[PDB]
Design an enzyme around this catalytic site. Sequence first.
Site, PDB file in Angstrom:
ATOM      1  CB  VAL A  18      -0.916   0.062   1.226  1.00 38.41           C
ATOM      2  CG1 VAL A  18      -1.825   1.322   1.142  1.00 38.41           C
ATOM      3  CG2 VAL A  18      -1.724  -1.262   1.379  1.00 38.41           C
TER       4      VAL A  18
ATOM      5  CG  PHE B 158      10.396  -7.211   8.538  1.00 40.36           C
ATOM      6  CD1 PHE B 158      11.118  -8.385   8.701  1.00 40.36           C
ATOM      7  CD2 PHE B 158       9.079  -7.162   8.983  1.00 40.36           C
ATOM      8  CE1 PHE B 158      10.533  -9.502   9.286  1.00 40.36           C
ATOM      9  CE2 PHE B 158       8.473  -8.278   9.571  1.00 40.36           C
ATOM     10  CZ  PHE B 158       9.206  -9.445   9.732  1.00 40.36           C
TER      11      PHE B 158
ATOM     12  CG  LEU C 164      12.563   9.617  11.737  1.00 38.54           C
ATOM     13  CD1 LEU C 164      13.953   9.044  11.492  1.00 38.54           C
ATOM     14  CD2 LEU C 164      11.520   8.895  10.918  1.00 38.54           C
TER      15      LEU C 164
ATOM     16  CG  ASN D  59       9.844   5.708  18.831  1.00 38.58           C
ATOM     17  OD1 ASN D  59       9.906   6.268  19.922  1.00 38.58           O
ATOM     18  ND2 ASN D  59      10.546   4.611  18.544  1.00 38.58           N
TER      19      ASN D  59
ATOM     20  NE  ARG E 248      10.419  14.804  18.867  1.00 40.28           N
ATOM     21  CZ  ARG E 248      10.315  13.474  18.696  1.00 40.28           C
ATOM     22  NH1 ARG E 248       9.738  12.712  19.619  1.00 40.28           N
ATOM     23  NH2 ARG E 248      10.780  12.899  17.583  1.00 40.28           N
TER      24      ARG E 248
ATOM     25  CE1 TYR F 266      -1.064  -6.192  10.995  1.00 38.93           C
ATOM     26  CE2 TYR F 266      -3.327  -7.003  11.101  1.00 38.93           C
ATOM     27  CZ  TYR F 266      -2.358  -6.203  10.507  1.00 38.93           C
ATOM     28  OH  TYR F 266      -2.687  -5.430   9.422  1.00 38.93           O
TER      29      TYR F 266
END
Lengths: 307, 306
Positions: A13, A35, A62, A98, A105, A144
């Site tokens: 996708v 992955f 990140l 994250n 931020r 999942y």
Amino acid sequence: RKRILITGGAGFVGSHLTDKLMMDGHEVTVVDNFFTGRKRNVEHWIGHENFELINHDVVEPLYIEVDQIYHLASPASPPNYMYNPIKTLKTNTIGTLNMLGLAKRVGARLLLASTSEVYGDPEVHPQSEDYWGHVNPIGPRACYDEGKRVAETMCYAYMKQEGVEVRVARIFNTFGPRMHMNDGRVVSNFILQALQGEPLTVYGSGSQTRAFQYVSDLVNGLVALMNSNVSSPVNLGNPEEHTILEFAQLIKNLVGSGSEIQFLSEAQDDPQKRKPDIKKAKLMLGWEPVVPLEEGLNKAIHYFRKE
Amino acid sequence: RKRILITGGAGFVGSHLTDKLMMDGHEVTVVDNFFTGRKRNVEHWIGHENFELINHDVVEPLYIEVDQIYHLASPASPNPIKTLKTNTIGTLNMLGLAKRVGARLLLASTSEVYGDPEVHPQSEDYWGHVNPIGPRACYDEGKRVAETMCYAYMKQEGVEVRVARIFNTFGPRMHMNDGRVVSNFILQALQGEPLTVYGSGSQTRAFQYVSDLVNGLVALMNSNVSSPVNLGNPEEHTILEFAQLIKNLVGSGSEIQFLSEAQDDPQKRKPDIKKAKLMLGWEPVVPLEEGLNKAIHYFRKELEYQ
Ligand SMILES: NC(=O)c1ccc[n+]([C@@H]2O[C@H](COP(=O)([O-])OP(=O)(O)OC[C@H]3O[C@@H](n4cnc5c(N)ncnc54)[C@H](O)[C@@H]3O)[C@@H](O)[C@H]2O)c1
Ligand SMILES: NC(=O)c1ccc[n+]([C@@H]2O[C@H](COP(=O)([O-])OP(=O)(O)OC[C@H]3O[C@@H](n4cnc5c(N)ncnc54)[C@H](O)[C@@H]3O)[C@@H](O)[C@H]2O)c1
């Protein structure tokens, strides 16, 4: 115009999302650990002025200024995720924390690629976004399902506690070029069977139905949803039923390998487990699936034939 | 004997667990960041050779050599984001540590994994009915996925895990300003305030004395049962009976008093404890009256200390 981050952007996708966004003019950065994704998926844009590809696992922080984050980084077909429950949980948990931390931020709007599996084995039909789902918190799929459930929770936590703007798509079964051919679902399976001469095998009379969504219809849904003001979850999928027989027929014709279709009249199919209500998406986004089944199968087969 | 880590060792349930285990001669280390825990809760052990208190947040990795980890570090209900991190990052960290040093890990889970249940009572193979995006999801979904984590580290990595689904618990050291029906009644009785009962006081609450729970946890830890086990008290008591018992045990001249235009919420969940009976030989053994007594003594003492 916009600065856009796509986690999982090198995947099925995500790479089609990249394409669309690169062609609308935006500055796209793709984060992906490969992955399950593949460089071939985004290779066309490497070198282009507005694109950046970053090899990066979202379990790591990140720090980048962006306007929008499409958070699709996550193992997606059952064999991939069930084989690594721990990586699957870490990705959906630490990785969503994250990306939400980045969004907070830098003032990005974040969209989460959730999944009809948050609904589990549904005791309501069809499934609308109100449904709380019926999900085993410790089965072999739970890594999942619960992983994506709690990722939705994280979103609304940051929305409620830190004024992050969040969007949540609950994505149903989707198909097309660059898809994975290992879900052992009916389309991947018929296509492989046909592409290599094998007979297409059809259980009973092929009368059970399946509802799949073509990837470009999904990608339009995602962008529509990202740029809307709806922050509660929205189902994206295609609820149109086609019989299994009809999939065999279309795939037979379009591959053109003179494979035969054959019935096992004593055999049987399971009814599809989930079926999306998409009325909320019509109403709030003006979106519906517009690609006809035959057309999407063709574009898909075209991809896989030359592959 | 055993070296033992207890995260959330300085809170209500944790400090009694500490008590029991020290008394059995084990080497006990408490980790706790004191968000809701108190040193007073374990001061009695500070100093003994076999005890260590470490001030540490479990969202930060931790390396210690132990044979068993009781992972209790979590707010019980009732910072939503910190609650999420704690139950996710925190559990991953403690399972990581257990992997590294070969420790058996007990997870203190909660009846809330059943959400707002649609079968009654709730036994362990009920999957629950939980709003993943409701006002309390960051507790309910966080504990649910903490479970998923234990099972994944067990199935995939060979970590020995135990999972206790804890139901409502009361006793000395508990958070007095709880919200809870039993709490309010103890505070008000001690003060000579009327005890007000909504409606006719016939909604029920079920309660488990802390030492029953702690026993259940230890039995569970040292069994071969890896799948989830309900630890709670199934015995029903009406809110009116709580009021009556507490009024009598305190003896103070508080009067009971109906407010019949008010309503109590029905009892949300009710443990089926067949599995704990059969597989641990456990069941609650402290009668309500005795437990309330030990709880009253504590609130009495503690009103007098704060
Ligand atoms: N395809 C579907 O039918 C479907 C249905 C429901 C939801 N979804 C969601 O759509 C998203 C994409 O799935 P897809 O079908 O494109 O599958 P996909 O596997 O092709 O794409 C996922 C991408 O995420 C990347 N990724 C995985 N873990 C990562 C990590 N830790 N850090 C960085 N990158 C990582 C992979 O390398 C891959 O490119 C997923 O989040 C999935 O849950 C897909
Ligand atoms: N008390 C009950 O009725 C009951 C019911 C259901 C579940 N539980 C579960 O039992 C466990 C113990 O609960 P309790 O009643 O003792 O509550 P508690 O608040 O008294 O104990 C929690 C302890 O964990 C510590 N802690 C919190 N976050 C931490 C972090 N990130 N790092 C290190 N320490 C941290 C707190 O400071 C406190 O000392 C909890 O996990 C709770 O969810 C209890």
